[PDB]
Amino acid sequence: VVRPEVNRTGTVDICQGPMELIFSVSRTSSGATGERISLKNTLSIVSMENGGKPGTYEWSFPANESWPEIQFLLQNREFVSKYYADVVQTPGELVVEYRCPVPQFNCTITHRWKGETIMSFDGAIQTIRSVTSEYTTKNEDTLVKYIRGLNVTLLTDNAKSIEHRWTEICKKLKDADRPDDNQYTLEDDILEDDIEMDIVQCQMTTQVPLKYHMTVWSAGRDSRAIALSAIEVASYLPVNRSQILNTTCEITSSSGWTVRLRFSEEMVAAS
Amino acid sequence: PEVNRTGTVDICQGPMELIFSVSRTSSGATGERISLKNTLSIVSMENGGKPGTYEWSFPANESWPEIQFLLQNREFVSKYYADVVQTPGELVVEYRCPVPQFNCTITHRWKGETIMSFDGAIQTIRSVTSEYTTKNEDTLVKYIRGLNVTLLTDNAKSIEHRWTEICKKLKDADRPDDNQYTLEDDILEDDIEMDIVQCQMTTQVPLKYHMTVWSAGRDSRAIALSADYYTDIEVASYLPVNRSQILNTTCEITSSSGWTVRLRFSEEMVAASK
Ligand SMILES: *[C@@H]1O[C@H](CO)[C@@H](O[C@@H]2O[C@H](CO)[C@@H](O[C@@H]3O[C@H](CO)[C@@H](O)[C@H](O)[C@@H]3O)[C@H](O)[C@H]2NC(C)=O)[C@H](O)[C@H]1NC(C)=O
Ligand SMILES: *[C@@H]1O[C@H](CO)[C@@H](O[C@@H]2O[C@H](CO)[C@@H](O)[C@H](O)[C@H]2NC(C)=O)[C@H](O)[C@H]1NC(C)=O
Ligand SMILES: *[C@H]1O[C@H](CO)[C@@H](O)[C@H](O)[C@H]1NC(C)=O
Known part of the structure; x- marks a missing residue:
């Protein structure tokens, strides 16, 4: 010690600038799953590991399964399992990641296979990066079913409520x-x-x-x-x-x- | 078409760089390549084959010191791999070499991810050892700096001359x-x-x-x-x-x-x- x-x-205000929430949902061949929420300059604040209860830290609010952001994660766990099941034909981790400006929520979504980007969507342009054989014997048509991920209506219906909560959380993080x-x-x-x-x-x-x-x-x-x-x-x-x-x-x-x-x-x- | x-540029302008890439797989497959800074490989060998190159270039001559440097690194990487790698995956050693001044940079990649590097004064290890090695960082550091480039420096100007002509033939091709x-x-x-x-x-x-x-x-x-599928x-x-x-x-x-x-x-x- x-x-x-x-x-x-060179100290910065972590709660300064526009707020961004990062939703990460992953699955491996084993059947290990993860769901995480981070802010722009943070690692995971709220997480769920292999289907367990939402976990967090002692300096923040208790994590509540009824929160609309966690309900978003849970819906994605389902989405990624179906996704994983058709497309993935060699072992490795699949990551779906939403980068969400708040209180809109015009999110970017990235798809990673073994750490590499296979697809992305900024609500204007869908992108497929051409490396399919690496992880599937299925074609780009299958992949494109999932490219946009899930609708974020749960997040946008509660957009402002989500904002004041995560501003509070960031403020607790700064104090800790x-x-x-x-x-x-x-x-x-x-x-x-x-x-x-x-x-x-x-x-x-x-x-x-x-x-x-x-x-x-x-x-x-x-x-x-x-x-x-x-x-x-x-x-x-x-x-x-x-x-x-x-x-x-x-x-x-x-x-x-x-x-x-x-x-x-x-x-x-x-x- | x-x-x-x-906006077409001159690919043979500015200071020349040669890139030597040497790889090994768990199953013992290998690759050795030379490229310029703005190209994929021009000369390559696959699973111990004879040097392969393109319709427009000099026949690839195995006695060229750049190519001998590749075969020399094949031996280095086999030793490196044997006592460092304990889980299946591709190891790549890469030298980035200014010519004719061969003060080279070296990068090491495991599964496409950078694990070690040595530029000028500074050796870098990224601490992910306990994902490819049961062994310790003291094993790694035996390999970080790579080989002496003496085969290259002894022949510096001949190599510069050969690759200046290869670059022009490529630029023409x-x-x-x-x-x-x-x-x-x-x-x-x-x-x-x-x-x-x-x-x-x-x-x-x-x-x-x-x-x-x-x-x-x-x-x-x-x-x-x-x-780049090795001269393909x-x-x-x-x-x-x-x-x-x-x-x-x-x-x-x-x-x-x-x-x-x-x-x-x-x-x-x-x-x-139809
Ligand atoms: C999500 O929505 C936000 C706005 O709510 C979008 O941010 C906006 O993006 C535009 C276009 O990139 C930015 O305009 C640019 O502004 C700069 C600086 O003034 C200017 O020099 C450029 O020429 C350009 O006009 C704008 O600043 C920015 N607004 C805010 C409030 O951040 C964002 O692009 C949306 N994201 C997605 C994924 O659709
Ligand atoms: C598809 O693209 C072609 C090529 O850009 C378009 O043809 C052009 O049409 C406009 C309007 O008639 C002309 O000003 C251009 O000179 C045409 N270009 C050429 C090369 O012929 C065509 O309009 C597009 N088709 C559709 C359905 O939008
Ligand atoms: C070595 O060559 C010269 C030494 O002055 C310099 O221009 C260059 O930065 C050096 N290159 C590397 C990458 O070590």
Whole structure:
């Protein structure tokens, strides 16, 4: 455990600018399912994992299955299962994602297969990217049944109600975003059998689902490891044990702050 | 076939770059390619075959040091793969090399995703190790920097000269009217409101191509990029279309040399209940 050095220069207002809600609905070959709601600069705030109850964080409203945004997700779970069942003929994850300006809700929808975009729709242009064989023996006509996704009437009927709720949620997220309350770790001695080489681990634990970018730099800054949040953030750098000192870790948030940790001579001595 | 050559560039201008791509699969399939910065591969080898190239170029000579550098990397990647990769997938090592000044960049890709890189001063690992390796980042870093480019630097100017001539022959070979273009419906035989319009282009010129098939309203499109099947160039795109709106579906092909080819599904072409 290590104490953060908080560089706040380049701080942004996460609740500033136009509001955007991101609805992500995924399915794998196993039958694993996910439904998530995020904001523009956040990871998942409300989620449902393999058909469980809507889950969230202790700094926000309890997640309610009767909320019109979650009813939207549940309808999509159904849609994606039917979708998955005709089209998908090789194993892999299918992701349908709505990017929704609020209070309209003229949404963009992206379809990803194994992380790649196979289709999209901005309500003006439908796009199919030509890679079908990769994941199906069915043709573009089948695919185009699903391209537009589901109607968003549930969202637009309650458009304003949804807005004031997620403005409230973002405001709670901003209040919870306290960099000094996250937990920070700088572990060495991960290669116990290697006499000359070691791995330096940097980890952060948080209950705030902002996007995080973690870089572990070597002493000379000629070697780095990069991780992104997925809520644990962890990254691992191979290092020479005689150059473990001054190896740093830098973490930047989606709210604009930057934490740096340093492997000090205090920590070298105790090792 | 409606060719537009406004904006055509000189693909052999600016500083030259050679791109060396070397791949291995779990089943032991392999690929080694050389391309310029604005092309797909010009020389390639597939599953250990002899170098293959195009009708317009020098016969691919296996004794060329650039090609020896590819075979040398075949050995590197086999060793790399054996002790790093513990789950099925394609590993690609890619050198981006300025010529004649061979201060190269190297990228590593697993399943199409970048896992490691070394540019000038800085080695980068992206921490996704525990998805392709049971082993540790200290194993990886044995391979990050790749091979010494000594085969390339020893022969720097000869390579520059050879590839300057290959680039000119390619630039000369790039002749849109000598490519083969097809625009075709009647793919969906048992469909009442729907058809598929297929746009295809066959070429011996390994430029990068971007293909869009547009509906009559420019409100629906299919996009295909030229894919490189090892000295084999596929550009094919398929657009689902309402049969009643098939007229004026247009296909639009753009090359990395700057030209665009439009193919329109014309009134004349609709006249056909064959
Ligand atoms: C969803 O609806 C919003 C509006 O409610 C659309 O946003 C608007 O998009 C237009 C066209 O891109 C923007 O107009 C542009 O404005 C810039 C800056 O002033 C100007 O220089 C450009 O020439 C252009 O006219 C407009 O700013 C923007 N409005 C707002 C309030 O954001 C959006 O495009 C819709 N999205 C979808 C997926 O349909
Ligand atoms: C389909 O596209 C063709 C080609 O653009 C259209 O033909 C044009 O029609 C206008 C009006 O008569 C003329 O000004 C152009 O000179 C024509 N172009 C050519 C090349 O013949 C045609 O109008 C379109 N068809 C439909 C049904 O809209
Ligand atoms: C190496 O070549 C020269 C050195 O001055 C420079 O222009 C270039 O940025 C370098 N290239 C890379 C990618 O290492």
